[PDB]
Structure 1
Amino acid sequence: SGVNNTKKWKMEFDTRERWENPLMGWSSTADPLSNLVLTFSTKEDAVAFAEKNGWSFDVEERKVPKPKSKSYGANFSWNKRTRVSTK
């Protein structure tokens, strides 16, 4: 329930094929950009960086928790279903 990793914008490349190494069964790759992950302060910085580097991008809007009305006294409601049967 920690929110400290949802604060910066990320740039990740599309994942390519990983196969099994015939000798050891390791995960092989031929994708140089499989681990490349860039971090940005805003969406605009990320799109500018992607555009000047010529990378086609899709960017999705940041999803933040909506504000919620929390009331401890609702747990003991006189006539509402918010009353809890256990605590």
Structure 2
Amino acid sequence: SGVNNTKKWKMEFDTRERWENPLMGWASTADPLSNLVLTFSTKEDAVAFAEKNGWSYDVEERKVPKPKSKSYGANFSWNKRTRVSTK
């Protein structure tokens, strides 16, 4: 339930091939950017960084949870379906 890892913007790159090492079965890669993850304060900072580096990019809008209407008293409604059958 913690939300502290949803505060900042991230930039990552498209995933590329990983294959099994013939000797040990380890995951090999030829992609030098496979682990690069950048952190940004705002979407505009992330876009600015990508542009000046010449990277094509996609932006995904932030998904804030919408405010909910919570009422403990609703658990015990006289004539509504929100009445709980158990606690």
Quickly name the TM-score band, shorter chain normalised.
over 0.9
| Structure 2 residue ranges without an equivalent (≥5) | none
Tell me, what secondary structure is at the counterpart of 1:28? strand
Q: How much does 1:53 deviate?
A: 0.2
Q: How much does 1:64 deviate?
A: 0.6
| Structure 1 residue ranges without an equivalent (≥5) | none
Give the match for residue 6 of structure 1: 6
After the TM superposition, which parts of structure 1 deviate over 6 Å for at least 4 consecutive aligned residues? Answer: none
**Correspondence 1:67 to 2:62:** no
Tell me, what secondary structure is at the counterpart of 1:51? helix
Q: How much does 1:54 deviate?
A: 0.3
Query: What CA distance in whole angstroms lies between the structure 1 residues aligned with 2:58 and 2:84?
Result: 44
Instruction: Quote the sequence identity (%).
Output: 98
Q: Deviations over 1:4-62 (max 9, x none)?
A: 00000000000000000000000000000000000000000000000000000000100
RMSD (Å) for aligned C-alpha atoms: 0.2
After TM superposition, the score normalised by the length of structure 2 is: 0.99
